[PDB]
């Protein structure tokens, strides 16, 4: 096919920027710090469960919420023997506490019967609960967003919401139940891929990776939004053979396009690149948390990867910062290995863009430890703070199902300094496992 150029009015993780990362990531400024394995404990209240992807109850601006004197963290958890066993649990600590042992376990957010009682057609076919966010409303309610995964329908993923009813006393929190439990968005075909388009390809046998998950709630000027992991649809630069000739996905120059595109077309990664159309999508919600407006993606990753996860966005000191986690094993970029794991980041003067790369390339964090390493971390998440130039990076530690005595747990948190369009890991800033704030 003939070369063309089309941005679709959105930002892009370009091949040229990603190719700069292999050399850049040797700089300790952009490296997840080494952790000390002999300080690492299992979450004592989680009782033999793997606990991975986690997120704090957040205020509208992303700072950590105070629920009746408690911090609350939602986390995926399940049997280490069963990789398809995933439910959201709610942990909580008193404000002031920092030890991993301070985290009590209120149990699952949902009963099995909740999805049926919701009178929601998609929800009644759910088989797993995957990641999202949680915001603390102005009328004092815990408002959860998460991913409804259905294994019965070829891995359908649906952005979902519920209010979690929680009684608070001097000693404990107790989940009483949920309400307003409903599907919000399952893709539209034109902006964000839906599950039927995945099935059109031949589902899992095709090599395609359909995502519509990890919704993150944020507000600006009283407007409510979710920003989430997705994939592009037919009208904002879809996957396919033709996608490899779109110079917007390469950047730099036409000379770089010709060279990189012909290399890619001759490589064993041609098909992978064709299928790769990850996106950080966006929708506006109404005041009852239903869908107001499908919006254009903030950024896309055509040709480089199909999987940019754990969308996160917030305002900090007059600028908007947009983050995503991604595995080098699923990328098509020379020099990036299957061991490499990233938090990528971008910056704008507005929530809705346009976003340009942090640290010139997109690199913020790199982690490349062996999957077998007990101190392996993934799912890095920047928790904004009330004031200052630091955010707190949370992550989970130790791969799921790897070790009988060492489960997936809260990683030691650490600090990331952010100023303008640059970031750096703060020297020797390792905090307690699962610590959410600098202030104690
Ligand atoms: O467990 C699902 C949950 O984990 C995340 C990020 O850790 O994605 C993981 O699981 C996906 C489905 O198995 C994989 O495709 C991905 O490589 C892995 O990181 C979230 O995106 C998801 O909600
Ligand atoms: Ca795809």
From Swiss-Prot:
The record marks 214 as: Transition state stabilizer. Its EC number is 2.4.1.10. Changing residue 328 to F: Drastic decrease in catalytic efficiency. Reduces affinity for sucrose. Synthesizes mainly oligosaccharides, but can still catalyze the synthesis of low amounts of levan. Keywords: Calcium, Carbohydrate metabolism, Glycosyltransferase, Metal-binding, Secreted, Signal, Transferase. Sucrose binds at residues 52-53, 131, 213-214, 307, 327. GO terms for biological process: carbohydrate utilization. It is found in: Secreted. Its main location: secreted. Optimum pH is 6. Induction: Induced by sucrose. Expression is controlled by the sacR non-coding regulatory region, located upstream from sacB. This is Levansucrase. The lineage of its organism: Bacteria, Bacillati, Bacillota, Bacilli, Bacillales.
């Amino acid at each position: 096919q003939k070369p063309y150029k089309e941005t679709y009015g959105i930002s892009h993780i370009t091949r040229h920027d990603m190719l700069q990362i292999p050399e850049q990531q040797k700089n300790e400024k952009y490296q997840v710090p080494e952790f000390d394995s002999s300080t690492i404990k299992n979450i004592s209240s989680a009782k033999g469960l793997d606990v991975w992807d986690s997120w704090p109850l957040q205020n509208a601006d992303g700072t950590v919420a105070n629920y009746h004197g408690y911090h609350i963290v939602f986390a995926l958890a399940g049997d280490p023997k069963n990789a398809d066993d995933t439910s959201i649990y709610m942990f909580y600590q008193k404000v002031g506490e920092t030890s991993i042992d301070s985290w009590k376990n209120a149990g699952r957010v949902f009963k099995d019967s909740d999805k049926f009682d919701a009178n929601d057609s998609i929800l009644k076919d759910q088989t797993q609960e995957w990641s999202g966010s949680a915001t603390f409303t102005s009328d004092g309610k815990i408002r959860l967003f998460y991913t409804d995964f259905s294994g019965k329908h070829y891995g359908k993923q649906t952005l979902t919401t519920a209010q979690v009813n929680v009684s608070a006393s001097d000693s404990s929190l107790n989940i009483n139940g949920v309400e307003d439990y409903k599907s919000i968005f399952d893709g539209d075909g034109k902006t964000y891929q839906n599950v039927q388009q995945f099935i059109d390809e031949g589902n899992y046998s095709s090599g395609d990776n359909h995502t519509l998950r990890d919704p993150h709630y944020v507000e600006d000027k009283g407007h409510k939004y979710l920003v989430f992991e997705a994939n592009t649809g037919t009208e904002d630069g879809y996957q396919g053979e033709e996608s490899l000739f779109n110079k917007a996905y390469y950047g730099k120059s036409t000379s770089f396009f010709r060279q990189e595109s012909q290399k890619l077309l001759q490589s064993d990664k041609k098909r992978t690149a064709e299928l790769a159309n990850g996106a950080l999508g966006m929708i506006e919600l109404n005041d009852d948390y239903t869908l107001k407006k499908v919006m254009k993606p903030l950024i896309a990753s055509n040709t480089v990867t199909d999987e940019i996860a754990r969308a996160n966005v917030f305002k900090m000191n007059g600028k908007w910062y947009l983050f995503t986690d991604s595995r080098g094993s699923k990328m098509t970029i020379d020099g990036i290995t299957s061991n490499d794991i990233y938090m990528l980041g971008y910056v704008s003067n507005s929530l809705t863009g346009p976003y340009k790369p942090l640290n010139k390339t997109g690199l913020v964090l790199k982690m490349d430890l062996d999957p077998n390493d007990v101190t392996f971390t993934y799912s890095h998440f920047a928790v904004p703070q009330a004031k200052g130039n630091n955010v707190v990076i949370t992550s989970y530690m130790t791969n799921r199902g790897f070790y009988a005595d060492k489960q997936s747990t809260f990683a030691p948190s650490f600090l990331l300094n952010i100023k303008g369009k640059k970031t750096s890991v703060v020297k020797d800033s390792i905090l307690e496992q699962g610590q959410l704030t600098v202030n104690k």
